[PDB]
Write a protein that binds this ligand. Structure first.
Ligand SMILES: O=C(COP(=O)(O)O)[C@@H](O)[C@@H](O)[C@H](O)COP(=O)(O)O
Ligand SMILES: O=C(COP(=O)(O)O)[C@@H](O)[C@@H](O)[C@H](O)COP(=O)(O)O
Ligand SMILES: [Zn+2]
Ligand SMILES: [Zn+2]
Lengths: 319, 318
């Protein structure tokens, strides 16, 4: 059923596992993700960016998420707004029925980040909706302007805002080119345990796609041009999860799985022109790439662990 | 609003225009179709085959159709089960909220065709749901093709009570309808006779046109469809004038989307975000449909009538 981020991540924090949050843009992507989480009896966070809502004219994505929720009533499903930039984008997401929102004011100075975030927290918690915010900016470590999260400031930021989850900056970045090479992977995950203990809340890792070999090789084997793609190694994510990371954002891996599958069909069977002929394999490649990932995050088998608290009932938490 | 096939095609028949019935399977297809009919202010039939319902686990296609209905409240939109094979598939479509169904028992002998169709008509009409049936089989003239016998069409409609009849005049499903674009033979000559004898809206299946720009793009970017050929648009326009009210189109949309994705794959092999290629695929569908819808004649008619709900429609059959 529709689940808040606060409960879903609280349960992950308590039992030391992580929950993958997968960005969705259309029907086959949601189907591919759901087949994987349903098979593994895992909770899931379906997230939609402002760009996804635009691409889907908002209503189509809302209806698709409803379909997922209706079809698998036994799976805790959080519908989350990714990278919300204003209170207005948050009001919009809540009106579409979302149970969680991220207000990203990380490129503003600390006090303005706190101000913007507090406004969203007052509005969202009044409706039982969860809030994730960010302190520190994404980007690779290696004139540098990336601002990694300072644990003592994360402590103050959470105390001033009351957010349910905090996205941290530890050297990851969005996209398929996270590090110059596979031998040049530098992350700042040693601070995760410190942030977790000082803040006392679930932490979120962004730009955490792994760019698995199978998927990258298929794309490059069939006309694709992504020779230098590199993502975050799964062992690193597992380590961070053990330290307090409860939500892991993944988008690029599912995009690549679908693209690689389509490129293979186009080459092997050039006479086929039915979109189902290649979007089907695409959906399935997403499911297959996700199964071992979800097992490593550890959320497998946990979908049944708890009675899901509704948004109306969740309003009590903030009173 | 959700609209019956009986009302939608009755309006088309009276003003002598045809309504495109477009097969949908996912979000981008429904969005590309809607953008075109909304831009031309035209009614539209969105049709789902059993394969499309299986592909979408039924529920995702239902919800997507609800989105289109909610987003464009002023456009009459008929949601129709294409090629239903049994009363069981018809029940499934009716339970999902469909306003129209096709029961295709055309490969059965006339009596059994009539028996299967009548059973579906009793059940659907009890719910206000329209029924399309078929007499004659699809396939090219050139052989197991059985073109529609007009005096038999009259008897079939009288005995079944269907709201629309799909006719067999030499078209067939798919992208390879004729051996060569120079010898295309159809039977549009009998369309007017069937229309007058039956007195009801007629349906043309297998009516994609396989336009050159769409064919060329596929073959330019790695595709292998050198011999593809469709029905010339002028012949469909003529048939609409003789009484065809619904024109089934599916291959053209499949080709337009496939052609666009192949183009992006080749021009920007570094892109991997599905939105970068399905977006252009969706737009290609819309651009290909606009001149087709204009030629069918339904542009500007979306606001001609007040749509009768399924519940109100029950009274037509009592
Ligand atoms: O962290 C993430 C994935 O990182 P990764 O590239 O590692 O999958 C997500 O929260 C966002 O970055 C999301 O992918 C942005 O999507 P759009 O704005 O629609 O292009
Ligand atoms: O008449 C039609 C299109 O003709 P055309 O091929 O000329 O577009 C449609 O009623 C059907 O043929 C439809 O395409 C079948 O879809 P699936 O069973 O899901 O593969
Ligand atoms: Zn992000
Ligand atoms: Zn057909």
């Amino acid at each position: 059923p529709l689940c808040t981020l606060r409960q879903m991540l609280g349960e992950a924090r308590k039992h030391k596992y992580g929950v993958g949050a997968f960005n969705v843009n259309n029907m086959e992507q949601i189907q591919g993700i759901m087949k994987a989480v349903v098979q593994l009896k895992s909770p899931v966070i379906l997230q939609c960016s402002r760009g996804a809502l635009k691409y889907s004219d908002m209503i189509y994505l809302k209806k698709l998420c409803e379909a997922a929720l209706e079809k698998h009533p036994d799976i805790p499903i959080c519908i989350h707004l990714d990278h919300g930039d204003t209170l207005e984008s948050v009001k919009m997401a809540i009106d579409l029925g979302f149970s969680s929102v991220m207000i990203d004011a990380s490129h503003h100075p600390f006090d303005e980040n706190v101000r913007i975030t507090k406004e969203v927290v007052a509005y969202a918690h009044a409706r039982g909706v969860s809030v994730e915010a960010e302190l520190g900016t994404l980007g690779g470590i290696e004139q540098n302007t990336v601002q990694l999260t300072e644990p003592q400031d994360a402590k103050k930021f959470v105390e001033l805002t009351g957010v349910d989850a905090l996205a941290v900056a530890i050297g990851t970045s969005h996209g398929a080119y996270k590090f110059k090479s596979e031998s040049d992977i530098r992350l700042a995950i040693d601070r995760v345990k410190t942030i977790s203990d000082l803040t006392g809340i679930p932490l979120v890792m962004h730009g955490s796609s792994s760019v698995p070999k199978d998927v990258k090789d298929m794309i490059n084997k069939y006309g694709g041009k992504m020779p230098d793609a590199v993502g975050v190694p799964i062992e690193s994510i597992v380590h961070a999860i053990g330290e307090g990371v409860c939500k892991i954002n993944v988008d690029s891996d599912s995009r690549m799985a679908m693209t690689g599958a389509i490129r293979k069909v186009f080459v092997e069977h050039p006479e086929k022109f039915d979109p189902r002929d290649y979007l089907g394999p695409g959906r399935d490649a997403i499911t297959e790439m996700l199964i071992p990932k979800i097992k490593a995050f550890g959320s497998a088998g946990h979908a049944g662990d708890y009675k899901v608290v509704s948004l109306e009932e969740a309003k009590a938490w903030y009173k």
